[PDB]
């Protein structure tokens, strides 16, 4: 019995939706209205004291942080270790990419802007935040050099994690696929998964539209 | 020997790896990478780590980077038991949440946000936002320690090494009020009892604090 707490525009929530779909697991999806600060309710804080989404409930146990969740799901429920290989050297690449996503991409790239634009209602965003997004594209383009997937030669949860956030960066800076052909090819490859549209595609488009509506701009 | 660690003592994620190597009693070569001299940007270093960060670990022709990936690798490959990184999916999920909390909320948003501005871009005035972020980190860690002696449960794990390397470093920006944060104070004190703590984490924390003291940076009101 799985319950996922979150909302479709959220990148880390979509990373979990991709993993759940890839593992063909059934779950209840509970909406959490972040703009209304519904995550700050006493009832949600009891589930996740960091008051973030996603939170996964698995038969009474609460797990949070999307990367911890999707590793947990694969380790516990997958038929094989395909999505999260147990071989320590292969796992070390996956883990590096996941922690890259946690810090460099999401915390420094996305939440840094979401906080000032959506949470604080500010229209102007410091130029450093633009520079941070270009740095992310540059790194991811390098990470994809000579391989079809982000962490090696097979689909893993690192792909789910990073595609959920890297595709979201379009909300701030459109991806130039002439400058970034590897990133373009990799998103296109992942878009072919039958569950991609419902798990990640539509939420990306929603987030992009949310930020379009704010009319935010980068400071020079 | 077979293991090489690339890094430098003031760096919190390098110290996370030094703590783990010490706890596992592994021998290794320590190679200094002077990030102040931008030595991590040499083409030679980029071949080992294209993200040009420290730490990097070299193990028999393989390069691993990101401190959290490195220390999970070390325990899984070399430890006698999974004590420091339990394999039980549920216990593992708590450790993993704490590690990723360190990557994003603590290091990226808390420390590197200020370090880049102050150490490498020479800014002396830091926005109040960055002070508030450190206080929120202290608030979260205090909550995480509720009812237990360690950060991810009832036993020492790599989550303790990761988070103490960075949380102890926060003194460089905001001194820790142990009357407001008695659990954090006790937890740091408990880890300081580890005989390998002084060399692995303690010296470098003090170095980092002294580096920031010298810059004379302040937070805006
Ligand atoms: N790295 C974390 C990010 C979690 C996170 O910050 N989620 C955002 C939504 S995208 C959130 O919960 N914001 C509300 C809050 O922190 O109060 C993860 O992968 O779960
Ligand atoms: N979260 C990463 C942080 C790595 C990191 O950013 N290290 C800093 C030093 S504390 C660095 O290498 N700065 C040089 C650079 O990024 O070029 C980890 O745990 O390894």
Residue numbers in the entry:
A (entry chain C): 3 to 222
B (entry chain A): 2 to 222
Manuscript text:
In the present study, we have determined the structure of DmGSTE6 to supplement the currently known Epsilon structures. This structure adopts the typically highly conserved GST fold with two domains comprising a βαβαββα motif in the N-terminus and an all α-helical domain in the C-terminus. The Epsilon clasp motif comprises an extended ‘wafer’ arrangement of four histidines (two contributed from each subunit), which is supported by interactions with several conserved serines from helices 3, 4 and 6. His101 from one subunit wraps around the His101 from the other subunit to generate the clasp motif also seen in the Delta GST class. In the Epsilon DmGSTE6, a second histidine in each subunit, His69, interacts with clasp His101 from the other subunit. These His–His interactions are also supported by three serines, Ser68, Ser104, Ser163, in each subunit. Furthermore, Ser68 directly interacts with GSH in the active site as the Ser68 OG and N atoms are within 2.5–3.3 Å of the GSH O11 and O12 atoms. The His69 ND1 atom is also within the interaction distance of 3.5 Å of the GSH O12 atom. The current structure also shows that the active site pocket for Epsilon class GSTs is more in a ‘closed’ configuration than that of Delta class. Arg113 is conserved only in the Epsilon class and it interacts with the glutamyl part of GSH, suggesting that this residue may play a role in modulating GSH/hydrophobic substrate conjugation. From superposition the residues for DmGSTE6 that would generate a hydrophobic binding cavity for HNE appear to be Ser12 (catalytic residue); Pro11, Pro13, Pro14 (N-terminus helix 1); Ile36 (coil between beta strand 2 and helix 2); Phe108, Ile112, Arg113, Leu120 (helix 4); Phe174 (C-terminus helix 7); Leu209, Phe213 (helix 9).
